[model samples]
Target: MISVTLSQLTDILNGELQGADITLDAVTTDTRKLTPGCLFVALKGERFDAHDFADQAKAGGAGALLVSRPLDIDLPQLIVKDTRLAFGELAAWVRQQVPARVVALTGSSGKTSVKEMTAAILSQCGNTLYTAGNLNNDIGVPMTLLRLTPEYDYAVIELGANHQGEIAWTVSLTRPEAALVNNLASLAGVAKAKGEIFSGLPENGIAIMNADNNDWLNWQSVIGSRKVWRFSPNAANSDFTATNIHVTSHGTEFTLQTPTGSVDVLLPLPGRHNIANALAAAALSMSVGATLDAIKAGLANLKAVPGRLFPIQLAENQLLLDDSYNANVGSMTAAVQVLAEMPGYRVLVVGDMAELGAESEACHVQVGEAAKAAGIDRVLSVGKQSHAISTASGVGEHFADKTALITRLKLLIAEQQVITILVKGSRSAAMEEVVRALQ
Candidate 1:
């Protein structure tokens, strides 16, 4: 954090300050990660309460504590009704002290990828900080903000939500100067959930949107009167658009047409959907003071994050697409399209999408139809929920266990001259085990 006095922290948190006012520059929730003079905020979770670690935080040289109740520790404390909310307030205070150009993003599927690419663009301009890994939620958003300092010229925050009010809360904490809601997959309550980012922006703030999404017109109204930038792969009217797309077995080449100029970008990532992601990254980066060259160079140099459609070479003639990170109907359908365009015989191995509850089997069946529609040569499925996929397609087959699937996979690798195998499932399915077994 960009340094704050304990007096300022108490006023911002509207809490009872238990000790003399002091100056501090750091804040943390975990004692293990504590530094001298850092204020430790104790948060309560489902299974564990961080207040129990207050003693350890003091021993580790914590300067102060944010706690729900008074602690036995000798350090100064900020007593609040809910330490979690107080932590968010303190983080928001820190964000205001740093004069960085902050931009935030949220989406149904491509949030992490677009966030990674945009951060790279900002880094080309100046020192940049970004949300790392899957830390786009409430706890993660504020935690990321707490790291903000005067040295950073840019901060790219990724916002993700599983519930309706989650992004609203996280975005309030972010208070970004510019924000974007990436493409919302059709009818998943994702539209309503992600649109919250637009409303969270200040009246004068900028909201970047994808002009080609089905809900473009609706989102335009969602950002009514706010400054907006649009990015698209196929839209006739957009601030940033792609044209002359040339897709090859190895990568994609597209002419990125921006308001100021055009650049030919060679993106090593697979799938046409990534073209849209690049456009989003470019536009978001532009909103946050990135130069045109920075945008083009950043997009061209972007690498795929592991487990998010990341490819691996298993052998001379064989390839593995490890999308086992997580799965949804939209992402699953798009992954199949990439396989359909690959150079050799393609096989899609999948497990349950998970958490669909009553619609679980229907979604799995839809995935089978998607594979067939995309011209996938074979589909091998595991788990009872995904067995519906095998029964729904003529070229599909279900396996009783991972060992059975591995046996068939090895045989196919030996028989085919060229092959691309994709292993995908929700994180709970442990689908990566199949890829590990093959290796």
Candidate 2:
């Protein structure tokens, strides 16, 4: 942060000040994460009031407190009507103050991977900061922007949401110069929700979109006069297209064709969806003037976003594809397709994918059929919803709980019958536990 003072913050939020003037370098909401010269914003939620931890935050070296009411402590305080909204305002103010060019993106499936790839590629050309972990939501977007400093040359902000208007709200805070939408869905108003990122974009801003997505034409029609860079793996007319694409157990190789020039890229990740993510990243990076050498180096050095088709090596020619971080119909089918292409006795162990609304059962059954269509040798499911998968597939088993699944998984691995097992599910499914148990 850039030497923001309690007095200045009070003026920014038009709030009441209750203590001596103090300057802060950062802001924190958690006492455990509090650092010296940082402001502690007391936020209230459904379960607890963060104001209760003000004294602890002060003791832990918070330089000032941001709260709705006066505190008994003698530390500097900025009293706002609501600290949560003030926190967001402060983040937006800092974003406006920073010199870094902001690149924001959103999607249902590939947002995180695209963020990682863009950051990795852009960092080779300049100082770049990206959203860390799953911090791409409402609260996380503000926190990410608050970390921006003049020292950074670029910031890759990721906006994620299950509903509409979320991208619009976060983009209001960051005001990205370049925006990208990775593959918006054709179902359930998701495309409308994901398209919200472009709602506040300036006319001079560039919109990087997926030409292959069903919503491509819709996105193009609504962008007004903004420059649109479209990328696709199969579409020939896209502004940036990938050709001669090949995927293997080790990595993916594709020739990225851009208007400026073309380069052969060896992306150190699997799956066709990842190639699309790379194309999106490439468009964003190039829009910011990153050179082809930097793009190649970054793509080659890019590490797999953990648990999104992350490959794990096991003993005796066996492998584990740990896609257990989170799952939906789109991402699950992509993972299953990747696993099916690998050379081995393919085994799939999946748990329930949450948040399908009324289409949950049909979604699970579709995934089971997809696994079978991809030539998977065995399929094992966990969770009540996943029982529909076993029943629909007719050749798979469904376990009532993780314990029973883990027991059977151990036996299967010990027998050396399965060469590769893909463990995947939504966060609540805790499919990562299956990976640990197998190890």
Candidate 3:
């Protein structure tokens, strides 16, 4: 973050000054990570209150503190009604101070993959910064913005939401010059939430969208007169489209057709869904003046996004697909399709797909049917909600827990068999346990 004085921050946040004015060059929420000349913001949460760590933050070399309540430390402090809101307000101020072009993206799925790919492509054009991990939420987005510097040419931010207005709040902070509306294939009003990024775009802003999405028409209706870049896997009408796509156990090959021209891209990531994500990333990079060669190279050199179809090697001729990060009907079905095409005995160890509300049971059943349709050799279902898998696929088995599931998986696999195991579930299901045990 750029250096800002306490007085300037007070004016920006409408906060009350409580101590001698000082300039801070950095910002932090965790005291353990506090550095010299940084401002520490005390946030209040359900399990913990950051006010309790004010002294610790000061001791760790904090130059000032943004707090909701007075602290005992004899240092510079800015009193705000709510520290979390002020933290976001400070991030918004820092965003305006930087000259980098902001590219914000959102979606129900593939937002992280698109963010990584976009950043990689943009980095080939010039210096770029992106969200480090799954830091696309309220608190995480602000923290990511705090890491920005004037030296960067672009800042590719991933905005995520489980409910309405969440992306709006983050987009307000981002104030992006360009936006990517990746597909929202699940959850009610998710497409609307993802579209909130467009509201922050300037007059000349570029909006990249998914042409194959069901909500494409609705998104188009709201884009108004802005420059829209559309990408599709099957549709040739889009500004950026994919053709002659081929998915294999090793990698994927596809023709990326853009308005300027076309290029053959060899992406290490599998699945047509990932290919769609690449198209979105390509459109985004091109909107910002990235070269076609940079887009092709970026997609080719992209690494596996951890826990999102991340491939892990076990014994010789054995493999593990760690997709336990999170799950929804759309993503789960896509994963099963990829597993069915692999050259080995396919095994699926799946857990509950949480947050489906009234559709939970039916969604689980659909996942089971998808696996059955994909011709998976064996299905091992974990979690209470996941037992529906065995009901749908009569040949499958259900374990009460991951421990039991892992034991059953070990007994089923033979040393000579070329087996590929897929472990997937929502974040709460902890389905990664199966992979850890198998290793």
Candidate 4:
């Protein structure tokens, strides 16, 4: 819980304070979960204006209100130009109170995995706090910071963005001492935008580079005076490297090469994409002064991020690989490669990759081609855009809806005595529902 006076909040937010001085113990945006004495921020969005819910906030026993405009309610209010931005400002102020070694990360794919692994390493070093779930958006970013409560020795904040200023704003709030720009953004412009996390660092901050990504040149230029620690599978000159990688369906074994020393690792997560994630995580944890021992154990102790290429056994011969959390061309193709190596008849099911703009055609087609190249027994796709995947691979099938797709998947299960099925899609596709239906 947070404890702050309206006077301090008004000053921190550069807003006008209305009504009597009062201290708030917590902050909230949703009235449904508002606690008594909490400060409720009236966040405005395109479809709905939270400012109108002031009376509801009052009824829920809000100690004060953070608002964009004056409300007739009697509760103390800090009237800012924009509550959403001011809310972040409040979290930034909260962050300054904690003397923690802050580490921030942003990437196309490995952000959350690296966040969890780094947090795992740091937690063994000392008390640590990190982003939970996919809560890396504008509102979620600040809320993650708002979780600071002085017990933390380290903070692993995940930064994500589609627009330009999103990273700039979040990284400013994060003000990390060590920042990792995770590997393989879909587009070059996206890589440049993600580099803003480096721009937000203090002069002495550490840049944890992914040498395999090789965007090191662009980001190195962004953080002129800051220190650098690079990690990769076999980038010879990087501060950290992994050699002799052994990939299995259950996990990966590799030699972790770091500046400090080398250690053998058995990462519980699968895929070569995940090795880059581990290297990045080790680089990140090392930047914060974690020991190589902690890095090795953390990689070993770290569990799979939910729906991220973990195996699920449905029966004696049926296995399911769920990569349905989200998707991109790189991640989709990577998932297919992992599935191709699995035992039994391989079935690949996918949904559309959203927000790709004009490149959606080539991106979706690549998944089908990737599956076909890997000798997948069957390819199944849904969504208007994903239908292009089936078109690219002659033997693939496309379904018009989830119900039809689920039905077909169920039918295939009965026919095939031994099969390995993998389900994946972008966030909007809700492919986890298909996984659930199969189960």
Candidate 5:
């Protein structure tokens, strides 16, 4: 935070100040993680009101609170009409004051990869700050925005959504000068919702799109003339694309073909989707005047995000991919593809993917078929809808849900050694529970 005054925050959030003037520093929502000189946002939720922790947050060294009403404390507070919208307003205000070019990224899948790639590449030119972990949602995005400072030369923020119009709303706060869409449909619905973010940007803003996506053509109807650039793993004829992709034990490597020339690069993460993510990042860098060397440096320095494509080495000389963070059609398929390329007694442990509207069962079945097509040795499915995958798999083990699945998995793992497992599911399915049981 760049020394934002309390008065500025109150005005931006349309809030009434309830205490003495103080310099608001970073923005935080967690009372436990609250540090000195940070603004605590008391977000109201469906099950609980964050205002309940307002005093604890302040006591934990929060400079102030962005709350809906007054708290029982003498500490500074900014009372707003609604903390959610007010947090968005305060985030936008903070980002606007930071002297940096904002590059906003969004998609159904690979948004975090593109965000990290853009930040790493930008760091080659100057200082950079990127969204940490899976911090791309409403609360996470606002918190990242509050952390923006003039010390950073570029800010790479990843915007993600589970429903329609969420990306548009998040990007509205970002006011991006440059943006990239990692393709939608990969998560739940078609890329139409993800395309909305790119299409809604300013006419002068740069738009980096995926040429391989089905919505690419339709996006032309939505996005104005913003110097469009494309990246693809399928289509060779694009402003930015990749060819001769190879899956390595360490990661995926490919030759990224640009308008200038082609350069072979190695990504430090697993999966073909990551290779596509690298293409988007490299293309985005080229659009912003980054040289090939800088792009390579960024790619080399990149690391896999936890639970996205995380690899774990077992004591019995086997590999496990703990991608239980989140799952959808595209991401689950992508993870299975990577698992197929790896050598071992391959096993796929999956839970139901949620929020597919009417396509939920069909989507799970598709994932099951994909596992079979990828030549997985065994398929284990948990949850109700996820059983559709094993039924479609024709050769899978089905458990009632995560609990029953964990019991089955424990017995199975003990029986099999030198087995490589790819565990994934929606966060609600509690895939981590199964992973812990296996260990």
Candidate 6:
């Protein structure tokens, strides 16, 4: 990241040097992608210990290895009590060297989307660096920060957490000056994450919360006098929000009603939620002294982040919503709502929605019920867990697996006709298989 000697890295990570002095150009956790003179971080997990892979990494042109135990190799290594903690420490050290105005983002559903949109806006201001896609976790955040240089004028970080206090640790490392709290629609475990990010901010740090979301409002209450910029399409009683929102085919066009007045802008992507994200970024940009033209210029070039509501044209005049990234109750429901507003016969292909804890069954059912209420004609339910969806909604066309679903989907389409298909599921489901099988 920065020009740090092996000695400095050893000290920063609080690890013992297990080999000769060396210089590392970069750091990585992946054993297969080792580069010459790179520091290999050996993280421990339930399935296996990366310490076993230290020698393999060393052989793959690695300059050094950050490990938890002894290794018999010619390559240099740093012995740490915990590799994950060491990775965090090294990232924090690297972060302090870069002079960019660190900006952190966290929300239940739209963190990655907002990160991409804001990255587009910030590019107009200066050389901006942002998190690549879903790389906003303990390991991923550390890896992302390590890519920074003093040349970057601005940094936008996306923070994600499933458990408590993860965001607090990441924010302390990134030291965000401005942060955005996008909409978190009651996805259980999301409220805690939203709270963590805001709570970790410095006294002067600015938080942009979504006023329309109850969870975000609850987070704002706990924030108590902390400087927050609220963004919402419905809630007018906020520090910053949009008014006169108009959804169009060119994209969503809306008037950004700010404390200073209003700026009419056209969103670069489809969906009202994306427009809301644009409003949040616009507010933050304006608050930081960016002109209306600069904000517009960046947004003009804004492109959708991959797999987050990315549209695809299929044969037979059908549109595919390839939002197969991560799906929870809030995002699923939001996407369905957006689809309902579109003109077409909507079809839903749903898979498992993971990590909802005890309410997983009820949540799955709720998603199916929402789709039915939205006037979706057919629901193709994949995976065993999603039976709750079909059972609860009573209208879902259930399938045992994605393969079974695709087979039935083809038959259903030929008989009933098709227009728009929304494909969504957890990452493990490999729901893209269904899309590929569609003819």
Off by over 4 Å in 5: 186-190, 234-237, 244-253, 268-270, 304-439
Q: Lowest-lDDT window of 10 residues in candidate 1? A: 213-222
Candidate 3 off by > 4 Å: 69-72, 186-188, 214-222, 305-336, 339-439
**What is the per-residue lDDT of model 3 for residues 1-439, given as tens digits with 9 covering 90 to 100?**
9999999888999899999989888899998898887899999999999988888888898998899988889888899998888999899999999988788888767888899999988988899999988998889999999888899898898888878888889989998878887876745477777877788888898888887773656666656789887888777668888888775555688789888999988887756678888989988888778889999988888878678888777766677788989998888878889888765888888999874687889998888888888888888888889888756865579987788888888877764268877889999998887878887
Question: What pairs collide in candidate 1?
Answer: none
lDDT of 4 at 402: 90
Question: Which of 1 and 2 is the better model by lDDT?
Answer: 1
Could you give candidate 1's per-residue lDDT for residues 339-431 as a string of tens digits?
887768889988888657777778877878888778888888888788876666558688988889988988988898788888998889889
Model 6 accuracy (lDDT, Cα): 0.76
Instruction: Report the lDDT of model 1 for residue 393.
Output: 55
Considering lDDT, which of the candidate structures 2 and 6 is the better prediction for this target? 2
Model 2 agreement with the true structure over 1-439: per-residue lDDT tens digits: 7787777877898798888888788888888898877888898898989889988997898888889998897788888998777888888899999889788998877887888889999999889999988887778888898899999998999988877777778888878888888875537489887777876577788888888774765666657789888888768668888888776556788788876888998987766777888888998888887788878888998766568787777775577888899999888878888878776677789999975587998999898888877778778889989877666665668888888988987777777644777899999998999988877
User: Which is the winner by TM-score between candidate 4 and candidate 5?
Assistant: 4
The whole-model lDDT of each prediction reads 0.84, 0.82, 0.84, 0.84, 0.79, 0.76
lDDT of 6 by residue, 1-439 (tens): 7667778777788888877887776888998788778888889889978888877887788888888887887777788898888888899888888788788888777776677777788888899888987888898899889988989988888888877788888887787777777766646566766677776566777777777774654676656677778777767657666677775434567776776777788775757767777777776666555667777777777666556776666655566777778788888888788667654566778888764578888888788788778887667788867777666655767776678788877776666545677788888777777766773
lDDT of 4 by residue, 1-439 (tens): 4678899877899999998998877888889978878889999889989889889989998888899988899988889998789988988889988888899998887687888989998888999999988878789988999989878899999999888889889988888988888865447788888888898788888887777775766777888877888887887778888887775545688899988899988887657777888888888888888898898888777766568886777887787888899999878888888878776788888899864688889888877787778888888889989887767765668988998998988888888878888899999999999998888
How many clashing residue pairs, candidate 5?
0
Cα RMSDs of all predictions? Answer: 4.5, 5.3, 5.2, 5.4, 6.7, 6.4
- Inter-residue clash pairs, candidate 5: none
Model 2 CA RMSD to the hidden true structure, in angstroms? 5.3
- Candidate 6 or 1, higher lDDT: 1
- Superior by TM-score: candidate 3 or candidate 6: 3
lDDT measured at residue 73 in model 6 versus the true structure, 0 to 100 = 75
